[PDB]
Every structure is written in C-alpha cells, then in structure tokens.
C-alpha cells in the first residue's frame, strides 16, 4: 500500500503474465499435456478457463490431423498393395475414427464396387471360356454400360 | 505509490487479464480474425507474442481440417457418380491442397488403375466378340492374375 507495495504488485502481475506466456507457448509447440494449474487469483479465473478450453480444443484438432496422417498412410499402403494386384487389401478403417474413418470407408467401398464389377466379368467370362454361354453380364449404369455390352458381344460369337 | 496506487495497479492488471481472456475465448470459438493488438506493456510482450503464434497455428489447423471436409465431400460425390456408372468423375484435387490434396490424388489414381484394367478387358474382349482373337489380356500381378487368365480361357474357346 506504499511504493514498495505497487512495485510488488507489478512484480507479481509480471510473473503471472510470464507463466501464462509459458503455457501459451507450450501450446503452440504441441505440448498440450500440462494443464495450466489453478489461476493465481480471481482476476485470472476466466482467462485460465479459456486457457483450458483452448487446450481441450488444441488437443482434439491435433488428434484429427493425426487421423488424417494415418489415412494418407493406409491409402498409400492400399495403393501399393493394389498395384501389385493384392486387391483384397483395404485401409484399416477400424484403427481410425471420426472424419478420417468415414473417408477410409468411402475409399474402400468405392474400390470394392469397381472390384465387384470385375469379379462378375471374370466369372461370366470364365464360363464362356469353357462352353457355358448361359450367364449374362449384369446391366451396368452410365459408362460402365460398355463392360456389359462388350461381354454380350463375345456372347453372341461363342453362341453358334 | 500509495494505497490508491496499488488498487489502481490491480484494477489495470485485472483488465489486461480480461482482454487476454477475451482473446483466448474468441480463439476457442473459431474467431482467429482479430489480432490481439499491441501488448499493454513490457511485461506482456512475450505473452502476446505467444498469443499471435497461437493464432497463426489455430488458423493453419483450421484450414487443414476444412480441406479434410472438402475431401470427404468430393469423395462422397465421386462415390455417387461411380455407383451410377459415371466413372470419369474424380475428386477435384486442384481445389484442395496439402495433405488433403495428396489423399485425393491417391484415391483418384487408385481407382484409375482399377478402371484401366477394365478398359483393357472391355477392349480385348470386344475384339474377341467380333472375330479377332489376336490380342491378349495383359499379364496381371497378384490376384488380378485371374482376370488375365479368365480372358485367356475364353480366348482358347473362340480359337478354333
Ligand atoms: Cl508383391
Ligand atoms: Cl445418373
């Protein structure tokens, strides 16, 4: 409450500000591990609340970007496997979660559809390759129509 | 420098703390638009530096999660298009960037490979469907080997 009082106040305010600066710094440097601890006094309660709120967020967002890194990893893996013909490989969707998992599942099902059209073609053409000319290629939509009529083309030939 | 001085110091420190709390709050609520402005005094310079550093980060991370939202969008679109047979559709990789763009390109090329094996099959089977038995299905790796030998199967039949 004198001059020494005012100086001391500032010395303290300065320090409070300093640890807060340290926390925000270990937040920019991905160290969301250390909780800020208790506020030093009433005047900083809200700030510290926002500090935790900011931590909880910086955390989630980090997890999500991570997932996305696993996704690009598994996709890469799946691509490698498929070029080599190991077409039963898929991005391990289970290991992922959230947005990343959805994307992963989308990719697997998208390829699955394409692969299915081949399993059929490979089939009703295997039969055609050994006499049986009974089966027909499934009617396919849009530009996949070709496949359906190219298999029908070879069906006429063999027939007769 | 008296009692009124100490009180005033605290009134100020309290306020400084308050705006800082407001900034960190509009950072948790995705409002990374407002720069903190200048520090109120030396003791808060570093803290404000970390405040900007934290803003620049919260920004980037938001952009990335966004990209990932476009990605899941385009993938969805591509899936819709393909089920309907519009197999020339692709995730618009250009509109994206960073990790998301890479993933998008991966997905497009992964499907492209699968589609290519079909373009060939549809071809060397169209020929087989109209007399020509000269062309051969390309030797394929792993489990795609089937396709290559199922087309060879029907090649023998037609031949002779
Ligand atoms: Cl291999
Ligand atoms: Cl349509």
Numbering used by the authors:
A (entry chain A), B (entry chain A): -2 to 157
Q: How did the manuscript describe this experimental structure?
A:
Crystals of L44H and V33G proteins were obtained in the context of Aer2 1–172 using conditions similar to those of the native protein. V33G crystallized in the same space group as WT, but L44H produced a different crystal lattice. The V33G mutation locally destabilized the connector around HR2 and increased mobility in this region of the protein, as evidenced by decreased electron density of the connector in the region of T31–V33. These changes had no effect on the helical positions of AS1 and AS2 compared to the WT structure, which is consistent with a HAMP1 conformer generating CW output. However, the increased flexibility of the connector and loss of the V33 side chain for packing into the bundle core should affect the ability of HR2 to stabilize the HAMP2 structure, and thus we expected this substitution to disfavor conversion to a HAMP2-like conformer. Temporal assays confirmed an inverse Asp response by H1 V33G, in that Asp caused a drastic switch from 16% to 100% CW bias. The mechanism underlying H1 V33G inverted signaling is not completely understood; however, it is clear that a branched hydrophobic residue at HR2 is important to achieve the HAMP2 conformation and CCW signaling state. Thus, it is perhaps reasonable that upon attractant binding, the V33G variant is unable to switch to a HAMP2 conformation. Stabilization of a HAMP1 state by V33G is evident by the effect of this mutation in the CheRB− background, where it produces an exclusively CW state.
HAMP domains are small modules, approximately 50 amino acids, that dimerize to form an entirely parallel four-helix bundle with two helices (AS1 and AS2) supplied from each subunit. Aer2 is a soluble receptor that contains three N-terminal HAMP domains, a gas-sensing, heme-containing PAS domain, two additional HAMP domains, and an MCP KCM. The three N-terminal HAMP domains of Aer2 (named HAMP1, HAMP2, and HAMP3 from N- to C-terminus) provide examples of two distinctly different conformations: HAMP1 and HAMP3 are similar to the Af1503 NMR structure, whereas HAMP2 has a comparatively distorted four-helix bundle structure in which the AS2 helices approximate a two-helix coiled coil and the AS1 helices splay outward at the C-terminal end.
